[PDB]
């Protein structure tokens, strides 16, 4: 769920995830996908596509379990949808950390998300 996602991001990046990503770029947080603004945004794009291929569980609502093992996110549990959901979220959190070096405060409150360029199909 949103709660696990927000936690992973906080863990990998050290940043308040809602403040740093809740309205970041064209893909991060509220809203849909759009053409990525930068590497950070592209992480979020890839993440929302990752959600699209899931069946059998609800990405936003359904909790799943994961652990923080040697400062590594490790997804927990069998149920094929929830595992894949966890892997989606993990990959985003790592991706956001890998790309903090180009994080742009400028894109942080992108209230113009409805105006992002449409995204390619996943």
18 binds, among a second copy, ligand STE, none (CB under 5 to 8 A by kind): ligand STE
107 binds, among a second copy, ligand STE, none (CB under 5 to 8 A by kind): none
41-62 burial, b for 16+ CB within 10 Å, e for fewer? bbbbbbbbbbbeebeebebeee
Tokens 């390619």 locate to 120
Instruction: Tell me: does residue 47 bind ligand STE (CB under 6 A).
Output: yes
**Catalytic residue list contains 70:** no
Looking at the Cβ atoms of 37 and 48, the one nearer to ligand STE is 48
Instruction: Tell me: does residue 21 bind ligand STE (CB under 6 A).
Output: yes
Q: Find out whether 53 and 88 touch, Cβ atoms under 8 Å.
A: no
| Nearest in space to 84 (alpha carbons), one of 117, 49, 114, 54 | 54
**Residue 31 burial (10 A CB sphere; 0-12, 13-18, 19+):** middle
Which residues does residue 69 pair with via DSSP β-bridges, in sequence order?
A: 72
Q: Which of residues 53-92 bind ligand STE (CB under 6 A)?
A: 59-60, 66-68, 92
* Secondary structure element (H or E) that encloses residue 73, with its range: strand 72-75
Applying CB under 8 A, the residues found at the interface with a second copy are 11-12, 14, 67-71, 97
Q: How far is the CB of 21 from ligand STE (least distance, A)?
A: 4
Q: How far is the CB of 91 from a second copy (least distance, A)?
A: 15
Instruction: Summarize as ranges the residues that interact with ligand STE (CB under 6 A).
Output: 1-7, 9-11, 14, 17-18, 21-23, 28-30, 44, 47-48, 51, 59-60, 66-68, 92
């Amino acid at each position: 769920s949103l709660f696990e996602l927000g936690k992973m991001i906080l863990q990998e990046t050290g940043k308040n995830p809602a403040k740093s990503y809740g309205v970041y770029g064209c893909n991060c947080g509220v809203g849909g996908r759009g053409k990525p603004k930068d590497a950070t945004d592209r992480c979020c794009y890839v993440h929302k596509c990752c959600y699209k291929k899931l069946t059998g569980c609800d990405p936003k609502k359904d909790r799943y379990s994961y652990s923080w093992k040697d400062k590594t996110i490790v997804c927990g549990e069998n149920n094929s949808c929830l595992k894949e959901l966890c892997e989606c979220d993990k990959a985003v959190a790592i991706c956001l950390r890998e790309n903090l070096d180009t994080y742009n405060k400028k894109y942080r409150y992108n209230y113009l998300k409805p105006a992002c360029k449409k995204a390619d199909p996943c």
